[PDB]
Design a protein around this ligand. Structure first.
Ligand SMILES: [Ca+2]
Ligand SMILES: [Ca+2]
Ligand SMILES: [Ca+2]
Ligand SMILES: [Ca+2]
Ligand SMILES: [Cl-]
Ligand SMILES: [Cl-]
Ligand SMILES: [Mg+2]
Ligand SMILES: [Mg+2]
Ligand SMILES: [Mg+2]
Ligand SMILES: [Mg+2]
Ligand SMILES: [Mg+2]
Ligand SMILES: [Mg+2]
Ligand SMILES: [Mg+2]
Ligand SMILES: [Mg+2]
Ligand SMILES: [Mg+2]
Ligand SMILES: [Mg+2]
Ligand SMILES: [Mg+2]
Ligand SMILES: [Mg+2]
Ligand code: NA
Ligand code: NA
Ligand code: NA
Ligand code: NA
Lengths: 465, 465, 465, 465
């Protein structure tokens, strides 16, 4: 069931309809690399949902009400007031991924000074760390562990909350590491395991009980806080009749602070937040806000424009609209269901993305000729869809030895910008895969014509084998 | 085939999803009259496409570039420049239906002074006059005749250009009336006959040949100029490879001036135009612009705001986008086709509206209990759709005798705001009719509880029989 | 004292700085007629304050929140709610001068049916009718009388409320005419007598006491309702500590309905209102709203766009801001004071406009060569200022005899768009007049090179004598 | 001469007018620290010009035309196209101070690999480094030298281009350091020496001749590129009749790349640019763009929103408008001249800021009781002006020893947001200083009630002594 839009479209961005011959020429000119295509030559852009979504009329109108004062801005205050009412959190820092680069060293040093945390021993835990969160932890000299559940990565076992903490694993790892050495726990909602999977409130409570017992800070990683609430409302029976706003207020009792990119569920193309619940984390607020100024070794300035704080102050509420959330999730489920139905297999698919197995769909192409890059190119040729390879092409070469890194699965990622495309586009995408699947034997592998040393996936150019 | 949107949605207006019990209470509170419902309680509002459509990003951004000067505004100039480039017409008057109330008396008096037109004899001709155009002609003491073709109103005969002038009828009526007595001809594109039907370029040329022979002014009534061009491109073989802009420039050679509401194909919620092609109609431009100031008997002032002229200067171009026009028309065709397929019959359906025969769908309800008003209410109850009755309820009472006027057909009109709802809404509407059709026997007729003397359809309240 | 702006400028419209030689060429090209200049060639445009003013951030942002529904729009409701809270008036009709053309025939017929008003006898009264209000009264066959006070037109007598009703004259005229024959009284605030002059609350109460005694409808003509409140706050001692919102609510007890152009104090470039206080005028609301649809002899449609109702719903509040009103009025007073100080004499000057006596400043030019048109041209040449002549040129020719009408005073009007230009522009204007005054003897009179039959001031072209 | 605004105000942000008693209470509540005041309680906010300025109608409208695609955005292309046409530079990277943190390590390593630069020896040169630029150089292990001219800091010697490179000093320092060891030269325009001082084109050419001879990269630090062009047009005779756009294109021949905050002359509240002239710096473009992704040690994402690139693409042109630049600079000069005239002395004053000597104005207050903080508070009390102390309070304490750092001058900085306040505000500020100066003896010093360890100026609270 694709639901009907709980909205009227009011503003559209025209996208031209190209011919097959035009797209054939285009994909050659961009070196068989959709990252190098002009946006205007892409009909359905599934590259990312981060900051590419539509917004409501009230959100767009808020951009015209900015107070651009360096300090004391009413736009900053409106944004802090939205955080206070929605999450119950007293302290807000607007960010231009909610300054993981700030809270991480702040929480490491806090435990260092207070409990004799030992940097050579330290380990941070998550139900599943986002890549960048894991990145800033490691840069700071912190090992991470994902304590996810047995069922997380198991497709063909259906489970309501596959993003849950492994509560026993978490307790065991804190004990094994030593709780003085565990500078924070990140609870990621919805979790980035397995395509995007929700986290139950019962689970967060149990997790937060464990963290409070050991006095370990819990940071909610909250880019998808509203979809997580919607899943709790839909699947966790205790919360069936609660509103999204009620589930969210209750949810946030089970963390000490939050970090979020606002570019997903909060429906804006710019911004993030780093927020602290109450005075017990005042000194962590102070220290973060201070490091925000001097993160570089000395003062730097700037910050979100006033109209963008105003827009986010509305977007935190509009992103919780129940009809909207029901519609958004149903559309993502509709695409995955329609792909399954035509025999396209995903290695994982969830709220965040569907990962199509291009290896299996295109079995005649060796992994080193990038069957998921071939399939991205072919989807572009056939339907003007742009999607990102997550396989050997992205994985790239060993920087010590210059050989191609080995890669377990050659996947093509489909993400869906919010409130941007319709059921007819979803049917268009399914139809395109049906065409590809049927023409699969004829699709060629790729080989480099131009290859950068690092980050090759963004600007390499390839030709057909 | 519903086509995929040739656009990304960028701004949405949220619409809440109501329960059946809520809508039941709502429709009672509004006296079984959807005109009295709050917009926010309507899920799919099909009341009208006039000024209810979405617009493009460039159009919305143009509202921020207004020059509000009383005279000499660059926003006025940008709008005149768009008219000049799109239609070839040299003289533009922005209107806040393009001042039918202005051109009509101007053209009557012109022929009066120049050719001895006799007001007691005069008759104006159209392929099909819009109601208001007919209204201002008659107020001015002018009889109108619609010279439409045999095939116009014939459903089950398919014909590519059912809005065409009856060229022989037009020649005969000018001859019968006397060409001194024919103050103008209005060519309406697309025509309002039969639900909205296009007019061929071959037909307009032939018509304009007739008018030039008699030196009779031709006014193009142009609210749907772009859909008319699209139909010519799709169905008139000579123009198959011409662009919409080329067909439109060629089209407008076959009139002397144009009048249009900008609230349909030009994609704005406010405005219209009254324009004159070249210096041969300079004196008619002068006289119109003059009457625009003193229409009331003395000077009055005002006019479109600058940002609205800017927005319309873009909207005239954006409304011609070929992918957009193909998509818009295909969606309207999709709804009508889907209604036919479930056994819902329309007495007429075309580009502008589909007229569902509520008499036939609800045969147990007498015409005086308003079966199309009942059906409007029931569609609201079942699906939250609002649609307007065009039957005995609208027709109303004889003002000399106070009895219900007799009415030939009890119809429910579906219009579709542009770029506002999706295929999923269209399927939702079809499903609602499928439900109604199946529950038809149980739907009750209506009778007044409150009835105004005039215009009763807007504010009367009714109850079930 | 020019006050400092109680605001930060946030959005500007660039205006180029021209050379004297450029302006000399420009004014020739426009036939010595500033009405024919391009807006972009005018540095300071003082043609009119109607719809040319700036607006606040919240007002501009409201344009993005429109509900474009044909009926039941939340934007209409927000606008009615602002009227209800600000004026206490229960019934609102948005207009695209607040439909004088509607209330006038409605109130005439009301008194006709109810009290045997006799159309051949009828007379309407005002403290001072605006030209268009007088126009629609007369078109409807109603004589008007302005009952203004002795002090109104007397400069050099200073009086706090020169827009007051002559209460004894009003009582005498109702008695002389017969109260059955007086279809309404219009109370104009601020009054258009003498350049714009305020009306006291004590005066409106006394007036409304007279009207209630005779049961005559009172319509508040309200384009400048906020400046009128500000003058009451500043000069009527009883109201010194009341807020503008309190004075306005109290003010509107002393009328039965209001009509206003929103294009002055309500700070928008489009719109007006026609509103009725309470159920005692329900039937007049019904009848107006009905005539709004069928004013032409049959139904016509349209109305303000949703974002424009939203914008006006805010603008009614923002136009009452006390700091803003103090600043606006002080700037207008600053210009007049600075002109007086350099020996420029105005025949009248008040809140609305300053009328410079060009006859006296340029005494060598005969009235038939349009000394105020010459002075408009010269101000353009010297400083790029555009201002409108109110003298023999505007007055024009007798339409029975073709001779120049006789005209008592040859004036040049300066109006000041709200929140648009600064003290430095005001000093620039004063300096320009100082230059003109000093060069006066050398300025030439004008004579026609092209003269339309009617409304010649808008498009005639002249040359120097 | 304050010039009249070469613009009409179109959008205003209301600012309430407070009473003296209210401001007295306010400044106490904010701990005698204007950084802690609400923006809404500040009448004239002179805290900073960075991102606080107004923008043009076209710039604001461009925010509605964003293409939010992750790669290949037409908004990115429009922004690169503006850079190409205005600066002649082929490669653009949009930044959210134009990524000093990126070019610096990139240019250091370039010279390391190519010329055997030795990190222990390296020194970068500028006519005057901005604080943050100096910061990122030093963090990267690079010593900086400012090679400014003798006349730079000398007030009472007037000199047309006090921001010029000391060309002989620069040659001597490269020779003394060794040109292999000089990773870049930054040319800052206008220069931040002495309150903001321009740099001649003759000087930049001579500088770039020196840098090309040694093959040292030159980066133009360009936040005020347009004011610098205006000063060249006004004072460098060779360029008197050239346009701002011509001077800017010619100027940029004399660098290899540019870095700029767009938040000053480019008139936006968000954004910056890092750009490279031609293919000779292609590899530096590649390396910067690459480090932009992996600056943290791993990939992070995001970047300016599409509407913000569109807005900056216009703002680069609108910020060059000659009338605007003449007006902006004249206003800043007007304030400084008016302060001089009443006996207020500035230790330095230029294009960027005026630094009032609070030590001299308030001689009875010891430096350790923060006479410039006292004066900031007093200006707030008297006139609602907010200004930032640059004295012992900002300087703060030695972090090794906890004692107050010694500070040479106790200054109060006045900066002026662009196109935000008028001559009447400037006169208001001068009048406030006149009052302060007259009441000087009575103003009290301050002492801490709450003092953070670091960055105390932002959130410390003080009381009167
Ligand atoms: Ca907000
Ligand atoms: Ca435009
Ligand atoms: Ca509103
Ligand atoms: Ca742009
Ligand atoms: Cl808003
Ligand atoms: Cl635009
Ligand atoms: Mg600590
Ligand atoms: Mg800012
Ligand atoms: Mg997604
Ligand atoms: Mg004529
Ligand atoms: Mg206007
Ligand atoms: Mg329709
Ligand atoms: Mg009546
Ligand atoms: Mg409308
Ligand atoms: Mg005025
Ligand atoms: Mg290199
Ligand atoms: Mg983005
Ligand atoms: Mg400044
Ligand atoms: Na709720
Ligand atoms: Na074309
Ligand atoms: Na108030
Ligand atoms: Na130029």
């Amino acid at each position: 069931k694709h639901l009907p839009e709980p909205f009227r479209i009011r503003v559209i961005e025209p996208v031209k309809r190209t011919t097959r011959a035009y797209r054939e020429e285009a994909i050659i000119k961009s070196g068989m690399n959709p990252f190098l295509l002009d946006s205007e030559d892409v009909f359905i852009d599934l590259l990312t949902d981060s900051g590419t979504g539509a917004m409501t009329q009230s959100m767009q109108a808020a951009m015209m009400r900015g107070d651009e004062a360096y300090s004391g801005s009413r736009s900053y205050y409106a944004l802090a007031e939205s955080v206070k009412n929605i999450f119950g959190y007293q302290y807000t820092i607007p960010t231009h991924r909610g300054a993981e680069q700030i809270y991480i060293p702040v929480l490491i040093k806090k435990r260092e000074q207070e409990k004799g945390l030992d940097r050579s021993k330290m380990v941070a835990f998550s139900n599943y760390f986002f890549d960048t969160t894991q990145g800033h932890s490691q840069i700071n000299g912190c090992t991470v562990r994902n304590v996810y559940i047995k069922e997380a990565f198991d497709t063909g076992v259906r489970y309501d909350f596959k993003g849950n903490f492994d509560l026993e694993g978490l307790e065991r790892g804190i004990e094994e590491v030593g709780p003085n050495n565990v500078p924070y726990i990140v609870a990621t909602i919805t979790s980035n395991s397995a395509g995007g999977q929700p986290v139950s409130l019962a689970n967060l409570k149990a997790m937060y009980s464990i963290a409070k017992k050991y006095d370990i800070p819990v940071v909610m990683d909250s880019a998808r806080f509203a979809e997580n609430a919607y899943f709790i409302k839909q699947r966790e029976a205790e919360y069936k009749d609660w509103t999204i706003e009620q589930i969210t207020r209750e949810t946030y009792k089970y963390a000490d602070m939050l970090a979020m990119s606002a570019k997903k569920d909060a429906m804006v193309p710019m911004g993030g937040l780093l927020c602290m619940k109450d005075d017990s984390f005042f000194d962590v607020y102070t220290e973060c806000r201070t490091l925000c100024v001097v993160q570089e070794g000395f003062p730097t300035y700037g910050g979100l424009e006033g109209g963008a704080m105003e827009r986010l102050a509305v977007g935190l509420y509009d992103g919780m609209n129940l009809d909207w959330l029901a519609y958004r999730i149903a559309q993502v489920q509709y695409l995955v269901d329609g792909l399954e139905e035509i025999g396209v297999v995903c290695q994982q698919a969830g709220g965040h993305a569907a990962f199509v197995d291009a290896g299996k769909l295109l079995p005649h192409i060796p992994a080193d000729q990038f069957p998921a890059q071939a399939l991205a190119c072919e989807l572009y040729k056939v339907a003007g869809i742009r999607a990102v390879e997550i396989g050997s092409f992205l994985l790239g070469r060993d920087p010590k030895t210059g050989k191609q890194l080995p890669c377990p699965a050659e996947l093509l990622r489909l993400t869906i910008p919010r409130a941007t495309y319709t059921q007819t586009h979803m049917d268009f995408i399914i139809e395109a895969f049906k065409h590809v699947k049927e023409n699969a034997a004829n699709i060629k592998g790729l080989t480099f014509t131009y290859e950068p040393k690092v980050l090759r996936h963004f600007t390499a150019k390839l030709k057909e084998v």
